[PDB]
Structures are given as structure tokens and as C-alpha cells.
Amino acid sequence: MIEKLRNIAIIAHVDHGKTTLVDKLLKERGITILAKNTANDYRINIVDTPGHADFGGEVERVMSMVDSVLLVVDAFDGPMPQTRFVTKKAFAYGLKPIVVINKVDRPGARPDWVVDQVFDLFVNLDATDEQLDFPIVYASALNGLDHEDMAEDMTPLYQAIVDHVPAPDVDLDGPFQMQISQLDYNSYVGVIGIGRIKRGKVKPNQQVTIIDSEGKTRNAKVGKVLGHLGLERIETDLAEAGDIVAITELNISDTVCDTQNVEALPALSVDEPTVSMFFCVNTSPFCGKEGKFVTSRQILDRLNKELVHNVALRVEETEDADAFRVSGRGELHLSVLIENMRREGFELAVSRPKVIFREIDGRKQEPYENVTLDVEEQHQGSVMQALGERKGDLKNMNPDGKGRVRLDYVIPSRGLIGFRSEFMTMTSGTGLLYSTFSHYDDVRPGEVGQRQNGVLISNGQGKAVAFALFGLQDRGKLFLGHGAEVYEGQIIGIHSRSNDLTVNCLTAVVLVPPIRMTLEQALEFIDDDELVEVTPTSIRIRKRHLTENDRRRAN
């Protein structure tokens, strides 16, 4: 069995062979088509390499599993460049191609010319080998010159895979050990851990442990691929692209292994998340009113549905039955997921975006971002200073002659959380800034992403009145204007000092117009003891615990 597995991935374009071609070894799929050839039997998994680029690095994860690749290229045309993004990543994991020139039959094809290209745009693609690049199987659909030529254009192909692809360097014995490479979901089945087995064996009930930390759960059902079809399975062992259920929320990169003498799997590799935040069921006094989906049931079902084709997203279950550790490549990764879940009719509450302090070697490495800001020459001071105050060391400034200046800080994500809102206030809109995650340098040390002020909090359900809002705006700025239905817990504006006030919003009358707190703004605002409650219409900000005497109880 073990020295006769061949694991490859395919690549193509629009005049796709693909399937067609993988159909033809026996629209549409996919993951992963387990062909099987013999004159010894060979299992041949043939995993699909997506033409789309979802995000993060979906293709990276695919090639965790495989040891070579099919590169189908149209003879008619030649290797066009959604093939290009993949094949780049395909050589980086040091994989040997098998080029396949499709549809040489069809009467306007340039089979040689193609191969001239399939080096050219291939030698500039880096490898560096190949060379071979052989591979080199001239296929047909409806199956002359070139190779062979040319019996039943079907058997030679089988030989090409088995002679140049090696079986995967894996260990049948030791413990059990599998990386979750891909991951998909169903509304009864659970979440399924699609993987290729790195060590050992899996019975369907067969207890195990899961990692980054200490998730231990029993197994249930463990279906392997077989044709366009995953069948249930009494046991599948090493090397097989075998796909598995019941464990958990199970995640990408996440790894399995015997609950004895193991732990764990490496390979980050470049998609790992930088920010945790809690998504939880809306427990407020509008706790199901302004929009439809609200059961925790509903939300996780939704969250896995993203988790599937969101490679950057990582969802975890809690000590709470109603909450979840949603993690992402960014915060703007999450604000999206949230905002979209608003527009779908979901109603949920979210804890502030606390970062991910991972740790390379000894010291807490934490995440950093290359920030760039474009401002008026007046603001420079008002801007430069505040970022310094956020542990944002300065790289460069290219002051562009006009009267503006460009500033290029690097900051810790931890430290940039909040800034966006205050940056607009300094520059009064003429404040062009955005950043991008850069790398994971060492911790800064000191507590930094922390706001000075405290909030004004209403003390019961009622419509607001200027008989309170006109006199409370002598304490700070308000998030609401006249006649908005609030509750005991709704933060309703920032205070001038750092203490919080449990006030009454209820009991020329000119209220200065309030603040347009956007979703992201309210995320980059709230404390560890506060929450953002999102309905499909409204954005509400509150306190984790709701009555003044419930806050006293805790703090």
C-alpha cells in the first residue's frame, strides 16, 4: 500500500482539461478524485489546485499534501496566467512538475511552441530544476505526432505519474499524526478535517489530541476519498489524503495525533492569524428585535461556513456556550465577517480586538504593522507625537514640496488599535492613512493600546430627551441625539475625565450633533469590560455587566 500512493495536484485555465481530464482517468470537482491504476495497485490522489485565489494562501495548504503536480496546458493556446500564481507556489515547496499538453487533436494546435513557452514562462518562474519538466505527456480529450506516439492516450499518462512522482515521505508506525490541510463543513456532520496522514493509523472511534494548545476529543467517523466520493472507513492509515469528522471547532493548520507520545505538527506557515476576538450571542434588552438570526446555534453554523473558504479565519469554542474565539489575518478581516453577518440579518455582540501574542523563541513576539500616513504640514506634530506615544518607531518621511508630508511608521498592531478614529480628529479628514501587517518582531513591554477616557452610561430603557442631553454635553461628547431608545448598559458618549458615569438620558434647545460610530470604530473603542452589540440596522455599544450595582459587584 504505502510505496504505491501518488499524491499530485492539477493546474489549468478556461480551455481547461482538468475534468475532462481527471474525469477521463475513469463542472466540477475537485477534492480530490482518487484514481487507481495497475498492469501492484497504485492509489493516485489528484488534489485540485484552485484557479481562484481566495486569500491568505489557500494553495500553500493544498501542497502540504502533495509531492508533485500535473500542469495541464492547452496546446491550442499555451499556459495562460491563473496557472502562474499556483505554479509559482508549486515550486517553492520543492515539487517536480508533470507538464501535460492537452487537446493536440484539435486542428489549431502548436504543441512544440507550447513547450518552448512552458520552459520560458517556467525558467523565469524559478525552480530551479526542470529541466524535467518530464512530465511532458501529450494528452488528448478524445482519446499523430509527438508522444507517444501514441496508443490509447491514457496508459502512458498513468506511467508518467507513477515514475516521476514519489510516494510521500511518511512514517506508518510511531503514533498517529495529521495536519488539517483543508477544511469543510456540514450542518449535521460537524466540521470535517480533510488532511493527509503524516504518521500512524485512524480507527473511527479512536481518541486523540489537537494543538497550538490542549484540545482533546474522541473521533467518530473517518471517510476516505474513492472516485468523486468520500466513503466512511473502518480504518485508513499513513500517507492517504483521508478526510475526517467529529473532532470538535477543528481548524486549518491545527494538527491531530495519538493521545500518547506525540505533539505536534509545525508549519505556520504564512496564513496564521494575528488578532483574536469574541463573537457572542446578543444578551441585551433588544435581544432579537432589529434583525432575524440570533441563536448561538445559528452563529457557529455561520462561522464554520466562513471557516471553510476563509483560510485566514480561525474559530474556537469557549467555556461559554454562547461565545467564540474568532481569530484573523487582521482586524479588517473580522470587521468584514461581522459587517457581512450584519447585512445577512445576524444579531451578535463582540469583545474588543485583543491581539495574538504568539511566541517565536523565548520572548513573546507580538504583531507589528508598516503604517503609512499622509497629512498636512501643520498636523505632523499632532500626528508624529501620538504614534510615538503608541510605541510606533519612525522609519521615513518624504515631505512632498507642496505643503504635505508622508510618514512611514512601524507600529505594533496592539498599539495601532484605536488610532484611526483619533487620526481623523487631528487632521480633520485630510488624513490619508492605512497600514498593513508587516511581521512578528519581539514584544514591546509596557501597556500601550489603552484609552485615557471613560464613558457615559444610561441607567434604563427609554427614549432620550434634551431635558438631559443639553446638560450632559457639559461632561463630554454624545454618541446619540434626541429620542433614541437606549437601555441600562448602553454607553451613550465619551466622558471628559477617565472615570465612568451612570447617568440619566431620559428625564433654542441645541444638542451638538453626535458621533457616527462605525462598526470598526466601535471595535477600536471598547474596553475589556465593554461590548459592541450589532444588529443589521444599528450599532450599539454597551458594558459587559449592565447595571451600576452590577459593575460595582465586579470591579
Q: What is the distance between the alpha carbons of residues 141 and 527, in angstroms, rounded to a whole number?
A: 62
Q: According to the annotation, is 518 in a ligand binding site?
A: no
Residues 6+ apart with CB under 8 A from 102: 12, 15, 17, 20, 21, 72, 73, 74, 75, 139, 140, 141
Give the residue among 278, 315, 27 at the shortest CA–CA distance from 190. 315
Pairing outcome for strands 236-237 and 34-37: unpaired
Q: Answer whether 72's CB lies under 8 Å from 86's CB.
A: no
Other beta carbons within 10 angstroms of residue 451's beta carbon come to: 15
Beta strands in 258-299 (DSSP E): 275-281
Handedness of CA 286, 288, 293, 299 (dihedral sign): positive
Give the residue among 200, 206, 199 at the shortest CA–CA distance from 221. 206
Q: Answer whether 442's CB lies under 8 Å from 380's CB.
A: no
Q: According to the annotation, is 201 in a ligand binding site?
A: no
Cell of 22: 481527471
Residues 6+ apart with CB under 8 A from 259: 207, 208, 209, 216
Give me the DSSP letters along 292-305: SB--HHHHHHHHHH
Structure determination method:
X-ray
Q: According to the annotation, is 463 in a ligand binding site?
A: no
| Phi, psi of 410, deg, nearest 5 | -120, 140
Give me the DSSP letters along 108-165: S--HHHHHHHHHHHHHSS--S--S-----EE--S----SSS--SSTTHHHHHHHHHHS
Q: Answer whether 241's CB lies under 8 Å from 196's CB.
A: yes
Which position has the grid cell 495548504?
A: 61
Q: According to the annotation, is 19 in a ligand binding site?
A: yes
Strand, helix or coil at 397?
strand
Q: Answer whether 203's CB lies under 8 Å from 246's CB.
A: no
Cell of 413: 498592531
Q: Answer whether 533's CB lies under 8 Å from 519's CB.
A: no
Q: Answer whether 101's CB lies under 8 Å from 43's CB.
A: no
Query: Whole-angstrom distance between the N-terminal and C-terminal Cα of the chain?
Result: 62
Q: What is the distance between the alpha carbons of residues 46 and 515, in angstroms, rounded to a whole number?
A: 55
Give the residue among 208, 206, 209, 237 at the shortest CA–CA distance from 224. 237
Amino acid found at 371: V
Q: Answer whether 412's CB lies under 8 Å from 448's CB.
A: yes
Quick one: CA torsion of 469, 472, 473, 478, rounded to 10 degrees? Answer: -70
Q: What is the distance between the alpha carbons of residues 30 and 32, in angstroms, rounded to a whole number?
A: 5
Give the residue among 107, 110, 101 at the shortest CA–CA distance from 138. 101
Q: According to the annotation, is 103 in a ligand binding site?
A: yes
Amino acid found at 224: K
Beta strands in 334-450 (DSSP E): 348-350, 354-355, 368-376, 394-397, 404-412, 431-439
CA distances in angstroms from 335 to 21, 274, 313, 449, 552, listed in the order given: 41, 14, 12, 18, 31
Cell of 124: 523565469
Q: What is the distance between the alpha carbons of residues 198 and 257, in angstroms, rounded to a whole number?
A: 9
Where does residue 445 rank: exposed (0-12), middle (13-18), buried (19+ CB within 10 A)? exposed
Cell of 100: 501535460
Q: Answer whether 190's CB lies under 8 Å from 219's CB.
A: no
Other beta carbons within 10 angstroms of residue 256's beta carbon come to: 30
Q: What is the distance between the alpha carbons of residues 383 and 373, in angstroms, rounded to a whole number?
A: 9
Continuous H helices in 409-539? 413-416, 419-427, 466-472, 519-523
Pairing outcome for strands 42-48 and 68-74: unpaired
Could you give the angle at which helices 82-92 and 58-65 cross, rounded to 10 degrees? 50
Q: According to the annotation, is 105 in a ligand binding site?
A: yes
Q: Answer whether 323's CB lies under 8 Å from 278's CB.
A: yes
Amino acid found at 114: V
**DSSP run (H or E) holding 88:** helix 82-92
For the CA atoms of the chain, what is the radius of gyration? 29
**DSSP run (H or E) holding 532:** strand 530-534
Resolution (A): 3.3
Q: What is the distance between the alpha carbons of residues 23 and 267, in angstroms, rounded to a whole number?
A: 33
Would residue 157 be called left, alpha or beta, if left means φ above 0 and alpha means ψ between -120 and 50 degrees? Answer: alpha
Residues 6+ apart with CB under 8 A from 113: 78
Q: According to the annotation, is 16 in a ligand binding site?
A: yes
Q: According to the annotation, is 23 in a ligand binding site?
A: no
Where does residue 367 rank: exposed (0-12), middle (13-18), buried (19+ CB within 10 A)? buried
Which position has the grid cell 454635553?
A: 473
Q: What is the distance between the alpha carbons of residues 531 and 543, in angstroms, rounded to a whole number?
A: 6
Fold category of 8-164 in CATH: Rossmann fold (3.40.50)
